[PDB]
Amino acid sequence: MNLTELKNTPVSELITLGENMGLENLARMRKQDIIFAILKQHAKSGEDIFGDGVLEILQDGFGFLRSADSSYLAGPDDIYVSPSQIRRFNLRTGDTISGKIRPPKEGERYFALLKVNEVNFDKPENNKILFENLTPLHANSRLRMGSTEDLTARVLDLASPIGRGQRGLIVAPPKAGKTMLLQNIAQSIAYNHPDCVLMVLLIDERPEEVTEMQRLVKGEVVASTFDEPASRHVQVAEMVIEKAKRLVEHKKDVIILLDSITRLARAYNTVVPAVLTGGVDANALHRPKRFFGAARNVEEGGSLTIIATALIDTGSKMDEVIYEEFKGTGNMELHLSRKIAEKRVFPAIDYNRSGTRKEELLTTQEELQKMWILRKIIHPMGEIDAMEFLINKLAMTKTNDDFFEMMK
Ligand SMILES: Nc1ncnc2c1ncn2[C@@H]1O[C@H](COP(=O)(O)OP(=O)(O)OP(O)(O)=S)[C@@H](O)[C@H]1O
Ligand SMILES: [Mg+2]
């Protein structure tokens, strides 16, 4: 007597019951559409129907349990929540409600929630929200990150360390090795810290890039495709960040690997304007600045760390304005050099103009002391002839032995 055995299933596989049930024809029905016909059939013979989703309260006071699998897309398989059920348990957008659901009545489109079991993976008896969580520093906890796959991660913990609940900005021009850098972060965080909920968000991304990201990354991978309207690029980011805070409310750590603040801001721009400077509404930047600005280490407990990408040298006059607005709004900067990518040289990062401010407190009292040694002999070093020196003086060693036996 259940139907939550597996909801997150592939399309061709989901037709398991489509080859077992007494269904007429299922030729032109979507994946989210076919679950609706199956759920109603398991309702025809009484039974109990369990279910879960992510809360999104609409303009009219009611909400729906949006499927995290479908990147919070609106579908028929969504579970409805009444305004009465919102007041009953103090529910806000971003909540992960789970429990028994009910079949629709006559004149009802959606399936509705019946019983509430877990809110935010916890009993309905819980407190303080992210908006009033005291935010002192990013340095009390650290996300430390001999294969060549650990070469696009080794430089990071020397060039620009990643703090727990830290605002990070990756700056990259087209074709600089940006997409796989995020895939290298995702590895050096899952294969190192499998406790903090990892969310990988991609705005206005290609269909082949999202599926590859969905494959290689362990965790929540929410993304919007290029064919989708400008409004949907917002909805996903609006839903990912609203769930993230809700988890930080439970003293839990959350890391968001957002792709392109620009591509997110370009969406936030085409969805409400008024007076322009170079094709960008100056008022529109307020909404995406709230997204990136939420990244913090909470004093009471938990963290929210957003390591997002900024696009420079796109060619567009709009994209040049966006990065300028975000220059130093974060406290962690990782530049990606154009010239190092032009001559096939990877872990391509501008070590020189890529620091990670407020460092002192993120490392031990002398963990930084042997890091400023190389940092003092980079000024006379070139650009493309600076990264080759960072491989040979690293490959023959490990992490802490990088200078103890490498000082002549
Ligand atoms: N860590 C890495 N190790 C080895 N090769 C890399 C690494 N990062 C990037 N590359 C190479 O650099 C190229 C960059 O392609 P992507 O991984 O898609 O990065 P990208 O700069 O985001 O590409 P665009 O601009 O979105 S088409 C690839 O062809 C890879 O071969
Ligand atoms: Mg890419």
- Estimate to the nearest angstrom the gap between the alpha carbon of 62 and the chain centroid: 26
* Quoted resolution (Å): 3.2
The finding on whether 178 has its CB within 6 A of some atom of ligand 1 is yes
Atom of ligand 1 nearest to the CA of 341: 12
Using the CB atoms, write b or e for 197-223: b if 16+ within 10 Å: bbbbbbbbbeeeebeebeeebeebbbb
Burial of 405 (0-12, 13-18, 19+ CB in 10 A): exposed
Q: Is 292 helix (H, G, I), strand (E, B) or coil?
A: helix
- Say if CB 266 and CB 204 are below 8 A apart: yes
Does ligand 1 lie within 6 Å of residue 148's CB atom?
no
Give the C-alpha separation, 142 to 374, whole Å.
Answer: 21
Judge: domain 1-126, CATH 3.10.290.10: no
DSSP state of 284: T
Output Rg (C-alpha) for the chain, integer angstroms. Answer: 24
What are the CA-CA distances from residue 308 to residues 39, 263, 338 (Å)? 39, 11, 18
Q: What is the CATH number of domain 127-408?
A: 3.40.50.300
Distances (CA, A) of 365 to 138, 139, 335, 355, 358: 16, 13, 26, 18, 13
Q: Which residue has a Cα nearest atom 1 of ligand 1?
A: 152
Residue with tokens 């890039």: 209
Instruction: Evaluate: CB of 184 within 6 angstroms of ligand 1.
Output: yes
Q: For residue 55, give every residue at least 6 positions away whose Cβ sits within 8 Å of its Cβ, in sequence order, or none.
A: 63, 64, 65, 66, 81, 91, 92, 93, 94, 95, 96, 97
Atom of ligand 1 nearest to the CA of 180: 17
Are 355 and 132 in contact, with CB atoms under 8 Å apart?
Answer: no
The C-alpha atoms of residue 389 and residue 392 are separated, in whole angstroms, by 6
> Does the beta carbon of 179 lie inside 6 Å of ligand 1?
yes
Question: From CA 123, how far away is CA 97, in angstroms rounded?
Answer: 10
Distance (angstroms) between ligand 2 centre and the Cα of 326 equals 20
The DSSP 8-state label assigned to residue 228 in this structure reads: S
Q: Element (H or E) spanning 8, and its range?
A: none
The C-alpha atoms of residue 355 and residue 369 are separated, in whole angstroms, by 15
Yes or no: say if 179 and 346 are a contact pair by the CB < 8 Å rule: no
DSSP 353: T
Q: Give φ, ψ of 50 to 5 degrees.
A: -85, 170
Ligand 1 neighbour 349 (Cβ under 6 A): no
DSSP 78: P
Contact 53, 70 (CB under 8 A): no
| Ligand approaching nearest to the C-alpha of 345 | 1
Q: Which residue in 167, 201, 389, 205 sits closest to 297, CA to CA?
A: 167
Dist. CA 79 → ligand 2 center (Å): 34
Strands 168-172 and 303-311: parallel
Cβ–ligand 1 contact at 175 (below 6 Å): yes
| CB atoms closer than 10 angstroms to residue 1 | 8
Angle between the N-to-C axes of helices 286-293 and 230-248, in degrees from 0 to 180, rounded to the nearest 10: 30
Whole-number Å distance between alpha carbons of 178 and 319: 16
What separation in Å is there between the alpha carbon of 346 and the centre of ligand 1? 8
Q: What is the CA angle 199-72-210, rounded to 5?
A: 55
Does the C-beta of 216 come closer than 6 Å to ligand 1? no
Query: Would residue 218 be called left, alpha or beta, if left means φ above 0 and alpha means ψ between -120 and 50 degrees?
Result: beta
Q: Are 253 and 197 in contact (CB under 8 A)?
A: yes
Ligand 1 atom 13, closest CA:
177
- Dump the DSSP string for 14-28: HTTGGGTS-----SS
Contact at 8 Å (CB) between 156 and 145? yes
Kind plus residue range of the DSSP H or E element containing 48: none
Work out which ligand 1 atom sits closest to the CA atom of 209: 18
DSSP H stretches of helix in 191-318: 207-216, 230-248, 261-269, 286-293
Rounded-to-integer distance, Cα 306 and Cα 101, Å: 34
The residue ranges of every structural domain in the chain are: 1-126, 127-408
Q: Select from 145, 175, 259, 319 the residue to mutate for testing ligand 1; criterion: most ligand atoms less than 8 Å from CB.
A: 175
In this structure, what are the phi and psi dihedrals at residue 215, rounded to the nearest 5 degrees? -80, -55
DSSP 8-state code for residue 138: S
Residue 88: how many other CB atoms lie within 10 Å? 12
Query: For 46, left (φ over 0), alpha (ψ -120 to 50), or beta?
Result: left
